[PDB]
């Protein structure tokens, strides 16, 4: 059971992600795998996860 | 059971992702695989995941 | 059971992530795998996780 009146509720929100990058450089080399990324924004109300970022085996 | 009145609710929202990039450089080389990305925005209300980013095996 | 009146509630919110980067450099080399990332923002109301970032085996 649940009830509201005038209730300006806010549940599971995000607000603003400024992410100015600049003159970077990223020279991955001789690897098994890179998973370089950038921004990421998620928002839920009933969930079992969020942004997963997995690499894996390598060798030479 | 659930009920509302005048309830200006907000559930599972996102608001704004400014992502100005610039003069980058990303020279992946001799890998098994790169998964470089950029922005990513998700938003749910009942979920079992979000942006997954997986690489995998390599070698030389 | 649950009830509200005029209740300007706020549950599970985020507010603002300024992330000015600059002239970085990241030369991963001779690895099994890198999982370099950048920003990450999550927000929930009933959850069993958040941004997981896993690497894995390497070798030479």
From Swiss-Prot, chains A, B, C:
Listed result of changing residue 15 to Q: In PARK1; no effect on protein structure; no effect on phosphorylation of the protein; no effect on membrane- and lipid-binding; increases oligomerization; increases fibril formation; increases secretion of the protein; impairs copper-binding
Post-translational modification (record): Phosphorylated, predominantly on serine residues. Phosphorylation by CK1 appears to occur on residues distinct from the residue phosphorylated by other kinases. Hallmark lesions of neurodegenerative synucleinopathies contain alpha-synuclein that is modified by nitration of tyrosine residues and possibly by dityrosine cross-linking to generated stable oligomers.
Coiled coil, from the record: none
Reported tissue expression: Highly expressed in presynaptic terminals in the central nervous system. Expressed principally in brain.
Domain of life of the source: Eukaryota
Modified positions (Phosphoserine) in chain numbering: 52
4 X 11 AA tandem repeats of [EGS]-K-T-K-[EQ]-[GQ]-V-X(4), as annotated region: 1-32
Transmembrane segments: none
Binding locations of Cu cation: 15
Subcellular location(s) of the protein: Cytoplasm; Membrane; Nucleus; Synapse
Sequence repeat start and end residues: 7-21, 22-32
Subunit structure: Soluble monomer. Homotetramer. A dynamic intracellular population of tetramers and monomers coexists normally and the tetramer plays an essential role in maintaining homeostasis. Interacts with UCHL1. Interacts with phospholipase D and histones. Interacts (via N-terminus) with synphilin-1/SNCAIP; this interaction promotes formation of SNCA inclusions in the cytoplasm. Interacts with CALM1. Interacts with STXBP1; this interaction controls SNCA self-replicating aggregation. Interacts with SNARE components VAMP2 and SNAP25; these interactions allows SNARE complex assembly and integrity.
Associated pathology: Genetic alterations of SNCA resulting in aberrant polymerization into fibrils, are associated with several neurodegenerative diseases (synucleinopathies). SNCA fibrillar aggregates represent the major non A-beta component of Alzheimer disease amyloid plaque, and a major component of Lewy body inclusions. They are also found within Lewy body (LB)-like intraneuronal inclusions, glial inclusions and axonal spheroids in neurodegeneration with brain iron accumulation type 1.
Domain notes: The 'non A-beta component of Alzheimer disease amyloid plaque' domain (NAC domain) is involved in fibrils formation. The middle hydrophobic region forms the core of the filaments. The C-terminus may regulate aggregation and determine the diameter of the filaments.
Task of the protein: Neuronal protein that plays several roles in synaptic activity such as regulation of synaptic vesicle trafficking and subsequent neurotransmitter release. Participates as a monomer in synaptic vesicle exocytosis by enhancing vesicle priming, fusion and dilation of exocytotic fusion pores. Mechanistically, acts by increasing local Ca(2+) release from microdomains which is essential for the enhancement of ATP-induced exocytosis.
Family per record: Belongs to the synuclein family.
Name the UniProt record assigns to this protein: Alpha-synuclein
Species of origin: Homo sapiens
Residues of the full protein shown: 36 to 95 of 140
């Amino acid at each position: 059971g649940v009830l509201y009146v005038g209730s300006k509720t806010k549940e599971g929100v995000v607000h603003g992600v400024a992410t100015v990058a600049e003159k970077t450089k990223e020279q991955v080399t001789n690897v098994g795998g890179a998973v370089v990324t950038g921004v990421t924004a998620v928002a839920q109300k009933t969930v079992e996860g969020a942004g997963s970022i997995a690499a894996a085996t390598g060798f030479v």
